[PDB]
Every structure is written in structure tokens, then in C-alpha cells.
């Protein structure tokens, strides 16, 4: 189904990216993992679904390490066919006391890394005339929240970047699209929940408290749901899906 | 997959609607077709892939006929689990010389029919706590083209309507979403192309004729691709996709 | 400034329409008022700012009365130069128990009247090659709220209708735009404010009780603020403002 | 009107920024210009309408220079009341061969400079509980065009950033909004028009040529028209306009 396709999922040693990675693995694709933390756990969790994945530990905030990483992809796997730009970081702060370092890193990782990977994978994709570039944005690429200025900017930046590359590839068999999830039950978010429960909150009170304001369904998006959406974007049934910001968000943007 | 679930697709005797019906049918779904023309050919086109579909010939511009269709879906098939609002007529004209009956018929069929089917299907869906409401809007639900004032107003309307319904059902296992296609290769459009080709035009040349202005990829969207996106919305993968307006449009809205 | 221009504002006997009228009259415009209730109070509240206004009691839910009103505008003032479609009505209800009557009325008044007025004033505007069509929609022409299906549909529809008419007049000195306010302090909203104060709530506690969820500024838009925006749209600095849905909403849609 | 208020306009030694500076000056504002080129001409061009403006030559891609500009504003004029982020640069290129240094420059100037200038002005504004922040994005903050990946990403970014700042200030008398113009008749545009006219093109034909694809009115936006929209945003009539992205574009985004 995706057999003979190489998928690069950026920041896939945890959360959403690992979810998406496992799903593509299940579908038959060769995966290259990226990101820090528990790395052989990440490799193995994907390995259980087919081919053992490759790995490059590029720090995405560094243009040099990305170039290195892409050559590795090309030298060892013959070039990326499916590029999932997923990695990203957060910093919540009022703007007047938002750290400049944090601004530069959030831009570098959440916006500029998508430019750099897409830059380096596209030539190979054009030669083979086939490709999938999927950028994991956020609801915050479509709307904003207070105290997330660098993140909302970068993610908005991602959405615009995506429509551009889509138009640049419009007349080829290469598509470029963005997913915009709302709250996803990742390691980070389950932490916030379990330690509301620890305060005395009932589970389905800890959850919807954290989700009431922004997400009408009062339910989380799962990494698996996103992985299934990315897989549909990789399918032939998505041949004319181009330049889109598809939200999976329990009703967030509809509101 | 969709075995034991009843899907009603309005305007499914031809084109986009018929394509979506076949795709749900092969996925196990029990269908009810709607529309005019060669019904037995529409029936046979579906029964080829799955169960012999039901049929009801309601004029969608008549509120009472729609109610009979829902009374039919309830009696004979146990109610609607998957409601696909699809049918949608057209009249190109400057607003100044735009016939009032034409405005009224377009609003009634392309907008008011969506209100009627969804309000009569939703109680059954709520009792079972499961349902999918999928409205086929268009790119013209998100942007405008000149001389399509009634059509754009209706489709915009359908998008708004979809968002509202999703919010009223956010905390259930019932979702409401809109799909917004660009140019779709219907038989209606194959005939535009053939007639051009019959006058000396190269095939690709006739294709670029129709698509160069509004659709960057210059490739049509197919009913099948739309069926596959509709089927994904029906999956468990789409539990938290709510009140969206997803463009499948060769890059149309991206400009 | 606007002296020598005729402005027709629908539903201008109360609230938002009356405010816009008073501002336009102040700017020199001849006004034609429309709407029900305390008519003389409205006529005089306008005439205090200069020229004493005209009036027509067309029920905008009926197509033929709008034809009467418009032909009265032409046969008594020599046409409309500035058409403010403001009239609107509301019904809050879950969809499955939404009255069909209210649905039809809300569509007729909030959406279809804009079609009927615009199609009748436009020929005259085209002859004089100058015109302002300004449609008061809502934030609900852009996002949705539960239990307001007919209203959100109509207003979304209005936004789409505006975009098309703007494209149709693109190359003339006629512009067509929409305004999308959030909560505005009109007599119905103030009556809800006093409702809570009498309940025991302190004033600035009753307002944000009404505005917290949807309007981040926790401050009302005023009919005067809207009238000043509409006036700017009538100016020549707004020559190239076309197809627009400008929100004035205290941060509603940014969220 | 604006008497007593200090306005800083980045990139105001020419074009859009100079047009906006002139409109604010004649409204009574004290201006601080910024940018390169013929500075004394720019000062003179503003002083003819109102007070002799200040100037600061900060490189907007350099964060420390920006902070010196703001320290200059605090020391010489008492702080910024009206901050207008206007300065923006362009590089047209397919992403594959898009120079890195150009990507970094465009992001820094068109996006990060908005963050730095706004984070430094906001304390002053908050203390006085009054302020306007107006960011000149472009239609490319809302849609994409081919081969402007850095510019579209940056401008989209500005739009997101604008929304989130609006929200951090929603309950103050400080507003933050984005203006998104289409093609503006700047000197560069007028001089590429003269180029075509010098080669035999009729005037309208040359303008038609430049505007045909993307701007339906086929008429340019002017710096003065933009200045007057900015000035309206600075009025009390705009108190509840927050985190908007208002297009003034001859119908570009309406398509
Ligand atoms: N968690 C949510 O609710 C949510 C919602 C919407 C969008 N998103 C987006 O999905 C993406 C993944 O977020 P997540 O929730 O799965 O978090 P996560 O921490 O679980 O995983 C993020 C990945 O990014 C990696 N990473 C961080 N910095 C890196 C760097 N400099 N170089 C290389 N890798 C780096 C991490 O190693 C990790 O593998 C993000 O872009 C996020 O904005 C998340
Ligand atoms: N009040 C708000 O907070 C708010 C917010 C956003 C948008 N709007 C919209 O502004 C417009 C007016 O709102 P409002 O608050 O001033 O209401 P309002 O009740 O104070 O008065 C509006 C006008 O509508 C007239 N009207 C109603 N039905 C009519 C009919 N069949 N024929 C002729 N006139 C009719 C009324 O006579 C009145 O003059 C509407 O379109 C509304 O949706 C209001």
C-alpha cells in the first residue's frame, strides 16, 4: 500500500509524530525517525509494524543538521517520498516578557525547519514525480490564543508556507498540505490531566475543565486519528488535495 | 466496515452523489438513493458493489416530500445513520437579471433541503448516539465567483449551517462536516470536454480550457476521490472531525 | 460630504440601523428609513441631524413589497446611491425542534431581502457609475453558535452573496461589502443586561456574564461605532474595499 | 484628533509607510519615521502636513537596533502611543532555489521585527491604558502566491501574531489589528508602469497587465487610502476592533 515509499517523520520519537510514524509503518512504508528522548523505544514501537526504521538526530533549530539529515535520507534510503513535518515546541508567556531566545527557537523549529526540509526533499520528489509533504500545524495556524505569540505566529507561518509550496507543485503528482489538530492526548497533556485528578478532580472533570474553553466535543484527538488522516492524504484518493489546512479539533475553529 | 448502517445520499442518481453512494456501498453500507432520471441504472450501479439500495424520489425543494423520504428511511430501513446532503442546482446570471424563481429554487434545494433532512434525521441519530452528517458544499461555500449569486449564498449558507449543527452535537458520537470540492469530473463535464475534442481540441487542451482560471493543478477532482474522503469521515478515525469545511480543490481556495 | 446622496437603510427604526442612519444623515445624506414600531421617533431622531428622512414600511419577508419600496425610492428620490441592508431577526432553538416557519422567515429577511434590494438598486447605480452596498451581517457570517442554525446560515449566505456582487461590480465605482459585528448594545441586549442586574448581579458583572464566553474585550460594540465604519466604507478612501467581511467584534473571531 | 499622540511607523522613508505617516501627521500626531534612503525628503514630506517628525535608522533585522529605536522613542517623545509595523521586503523564488540568507532576512524583517517592536511598546501603552498597534501585512497573510514562500509565511505569521496580541490586550483600551492590502501604487509600481508606457503600452493597458491576474477591480490601492484606514483604526470609533485582518484589495481575496 505504501510499500517502496520512504517516509520521514520529523520529531517522531514521541507523541503525534510517533503515532503518525507507526501508522505509515503499518501501511508498508519505510520510516526515518527523528527527535530526542527514548530513541530505541521509538524505533522498536515502529519496528513492531514492519521494517525497522532509520534514524537521524538532527536538532531542527540548526540549518546545518537538517542538511546533514536530508543527505542521510538520500544516501541511505534513496530520498524522501513522504515528508511529515511534525516537530515543534511551546512557550506560554505574555509578549512583553516573552524571552527572545524562546521566540527565535520556536520560529526556527516550528516554521523554518519546514522550509529547510521541504527545500531539500523537493528536487528528488520532482525527479520521481511523486511526493507527499504533510505539515502538522495546529488550530493555532488558523486562530489564536493569548500568550502563545511565537507559536501562533510560526503555525500561521506554516499554513501560508504550505499553500505556497502547494501552488508551486500544483501541476505535478506532488501534494503539500497541513493538518491542524486541536488538543491531542500526548504525553504532555496526560500529565496535566492526571495531576488535576491528584488534586481531587474526578477524571471526566479534569478533562473537560482543560477542554471546555476551547474544544466543544470535550474529547481529545488521538495520535492514531491524525495518523489515519495523514495516511488518507498519502493515498491516491487525495491526489487533488493541495494547499489545505484541515482541522481535526472537536469543533474548536467552528466556534 | 459500514455494515448494518444506513446511508441516505440526496441526488444520487448521477454524478458526485452516485459516486459517493457506490463507495459507501462497497464499504458495507446500506444505501438509499434520491434524485431523478434513470433510477434503475443508478440502483444497478450501486448493487454492483453492495446491498441493493433503497430509493425515494422526493423533490428536495418541497419540505413535505423530504419528510416522506425520512418517514420512508425510518419505516423501511430503521432510520438514517449516515446522511449525505449532496444535490445542488445552478444558474449562472448577473444578479440584476437573476430570476426570482431561480434564486428561490436554488436556496430551497441547495440550502433549505439540508436543514430539513438534518432536522428529521437527528433525533434517531441522537437516540442511538451515533451518526454522520456530511454536506457536499463546494469551493463556492468558501470563496465567490461572479454571476453565481444564489449558488454561492446557498453554499456559504450550508457551511455556516454545518458548523452550527456540529456544535449542537459536539458532545455526542454524531459529527457534522462539509466537503468543498473544486471542479469535479461528472458526466456533465465529460460532455463539455468531448464536445470540445469533437471540434479539434486536444484532450489536455480542452481540460486546461475549463480549469486554467480557477484550479491550479488543472486536473479534475473525481466522484471516487470524494467518496473516499466521505468514507474516511465515516471512519472511527474521524470521531473528532467536527464542523469542518474541507476543500478538495486542486489548490483553488489556496489562491 | 455625503450631501446629494440617497441612503436607504433597512430596519432603521430601531437599534443598529437607526444608528447608521443618524451617522449618514449627519454626513449630509438623504435617508430612506424602513422597519416597524415607533416610526416617528426614528424619523425625528434622524431629521435632527439635517435633512428630514423618507420612509417605507415594506415587510422585507415579502418580495413584492421590496419592489414597492425600491420603486418608491426611485420615484421619490431618483434612486439609491447607498444601500445598507441591515434588517434582521433571530430565533434560538436546537435544530430538531426549530420551527420551519422561523427558518423560512429568517432566510427571507436576513438573506433573501439582500438579494432583492441589491438586484433592484444596482441598475440605477450602474447608470450613475457610483454606489455603496453595505450589508450588516454578523460574526455569525464567519463562525457559528449552537441553536442558531437559520441565523448562522443566513449570515454566512449574506457574506457569500456580498463577495459575488462585489466581483460583479469589481470594475465599476460601485463597491459591495459586509460588516460583521459581535455583541452590540441595542435595546434588546440592554434589556438583558438589566435583567441580570435586577437579579442581584452588579452591572459590570452582568455584562461580562453576557460577553465572557464570546467577546474577549468584555465590551459592547455600539451602533455609533458601526455607523462610523459604514461611513468610512462610503468614502473614497474605501474605493478599493470590495467583497469584504470586516469584523468589529471585540476579538470574537480572532479567538 | 491625534494631537499629543506619538506614532512610530517602521519603514516610512518611502511608499506605504510614508503615505500613512503623512495621514497621521495631518491628523495631529507626532511621528517618528524609520527606514533608509532619502530621509530629509521623507521628513520634509511629513512636516508639510504636521509636526516635524523624529527619525531613527534602526535595521529592523537587528533586534538590538530595534530596542534602541524604542529607547529613543521613550527618551525623546515619551513613548509610543501608535505603533505601525509596515516595513517589509520581498524575494521571488521557487522554494528549491530560495537562498537561505533571503529566508532569514524576510522572516526577521517582515515577522520578528513586529514581535520586537510590539513587546517593547506594550509596557508604556499598558501604563497609560491607551494604544494602537497596526501591522501592515498583505493579502499574502491570507492567501498564497507562487514563489513567495518566505514572504507568505512571514505575512501569515504577522496575522497570527496580531490576533494573539489583541487577545492579551482585549480588556484594555489598546487594540492590535492587521491591514492586508492588494497591489498598492508605490513608486516602484508607478515606475514599472512608466517602463511599459515608455515601450508603447497605453497607460490602462500597462496597469491592466499588472493587475489582471490577482486584483479584479484592476485599480491599484493607494498609500493615502491605506493611511485613512489606519487613521480610522486610531479613532474611538475603532475601540472594539481587535485582532482583525482587514483586506483592502480590489476583491483579491473575495476570489
Ligand atoms: N499536543 C497537542 O495537543 C497538539 C495540538 C496541535 C498541534 N500539535 C503539534 O504536533 C506536533 C507534536 O507535538 P506533540 O504534542 O506530539 O509533542 P511531543 O513532545 O510529544 O513530541 C514532539 C517531538 O518533537 C521533538 N523535538 C523537539 N524539539 C526538537 C528539535 N529541536 N529537533 C528535533 N526534534 C525536536 C521531540 O523530540 C518530539 O519527538 C507539534 O508541532 C505540535 O504543535 C500538538
Ligand atoms: N444586536 C446585536 O448584538 C447584533 C450583532 C451582530 C449583528 N446584528 C445584526 O444587525 C442587524 C440589526 O440588529 P439590531 O440589534 O439593531 O435589531 P433591532 O431589533 O434593534 O432592530 C433592527 C431592525 O430590524 C427591523 N425588522 C425586523 N423585521 C423586519 C421586517 N420583516 N421588515 C422590515 N424591518 C424589520 C426592525 O423594525 C428594526 O428596525 C441584524 O441584521 C442583526 O443580525 C446584531
Author numbering:
A (entry chain D), B (entry chain C), C (entry chain B), D (entry chain A): 2 to 256
Can you quote the paper on this entry?
E. coli cells containing CL-GESSNitR-L117F were transformed with the pET28a(+) plasmid encoding an individual ORF to detect the fluorescence signal corresponding to the conversion of 6-ACA to ε-caprolactam. We found that an ORF encoding 3-hydroxybutyrate dehydrogenase from Citrobacter freundii (CF3HBD) was positive for this activity (number 2 in Fig. 4b). Basically, the screened CF3HBDs belong to the NAD(P)H-dependent short-chain dehydrogenase family, and they have cyclization activity as unexpected promiscuous activity. d-3-Hydroxybutyrate dehydrogenase catalyzed the reversible and stereospecific oxidation of d-3-hydroxybutyric acid to acetoacetate using NAD+ as a coenzyme. The resulting isolate, CF3HBD is a unique biocatalyst with lactam-synthesizing activity as promiscuous activity that does not require a cofactor or energy source in an in vitro system. In addition, we found that CF3HBD could catalyze the degradation of the cyclic amide group in ε-caprolactam, generating 6-ACA as a reaction product.
